[PDB]
Amino acid sequence: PMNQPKNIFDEIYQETEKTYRLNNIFNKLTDVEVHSYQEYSDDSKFYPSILYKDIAKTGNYTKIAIDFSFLNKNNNILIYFEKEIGPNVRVRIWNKYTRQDRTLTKSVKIALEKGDSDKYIEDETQVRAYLKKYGITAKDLDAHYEKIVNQKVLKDWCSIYKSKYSPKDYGQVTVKMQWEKW
């Protein structure tokens, strides 16, 4: 009552924190696997991480995941996904909702595949050079975000939880997009 969700990301965060030790709400979503990974700050605890199953991934999308950080000072949900954009190169679109300032920050990174390993690139100038090389515009980034975050991840949430929000009306949330002027 005192701390009801103010937007769809609060709703996901709070219902997952309420259920992840008892019977994770995402057990209800058949397209994903639920994982438990060791918390860095408390050796006695695990955080939940959601990974879309291969059956549930489309076209060039290689990964779709939701990580929950409940224990740290900048606690948050992170929804991210990755798509191949050229030979040995993937774009990663990174959408982090920070609880303490009710802010969703959308950003773009690059992964370079060098055989076994990935090398990760986040510096804005380098990222934009890769995007320009492979012809990815800000409008393309919006379309990828709409397709995966709104039409898949958040639509999936609304299929397992009776949301007070929706993929087209997030609620009260400050949205900051790295590529807004690109």
Numbering used by the authors: 22 to 203
From the paper:
In addition to the WXG100 protein EsxA, we demonstrated that the T7SS of S. intermedius exports three effector proteins named TelA, TelB and TelC. SiB196 possesses one such tipC paralogous gene (SIR_1486), which encodes a protein with 58% identity to TipC.
In contrast to cells expressing TipC1, we found that TipC2 expression could not prevent toxicity caused by constitutive expression of the TelC toxin domain (TelCtox) targeted to the inner wall zone of SiB196 (ss-TelCtox). Crystallization efforts failed to yield diffraction quality crystals of TipC1ΔTMD or TelC–TipC1ΔTMD complex; however, TipC2ΔTMD readily crystallized in the space group C2, and we were able to determine its X-ray crystal structure to 1.8-Å resolution using selenium-incorporated protein and the selenium single wavelength anomalous dispersion technique. TipC2ΔTMD adopts a mixed α/β fold consisting of three α-helices and seven β-strands that fold together to give the protein a distinct crescent-shaped appearance. This shape is characterized by a concave surface formed by a seven-stranded β-sheet and a convex surface generated by the positions of three α-helices. The resulting TipC1ΔTMD model (residues 23–204) had a template modeling score of 0.65, indicating that the probability that our TipC1ΔTMD model has the same overall topology and fold as TipC2ΔTMD is greater than 95%. We next mapped the amino acids that vary between TipC1 and TipC2 onto the surface of the TipC1ΔTMD model, restricting our selection to amino acid R-groups with differing polarity. This analysis revealed that the majority of conserved residues are found on the convex surface, while the variable residues were predominantly found on the concave surface.
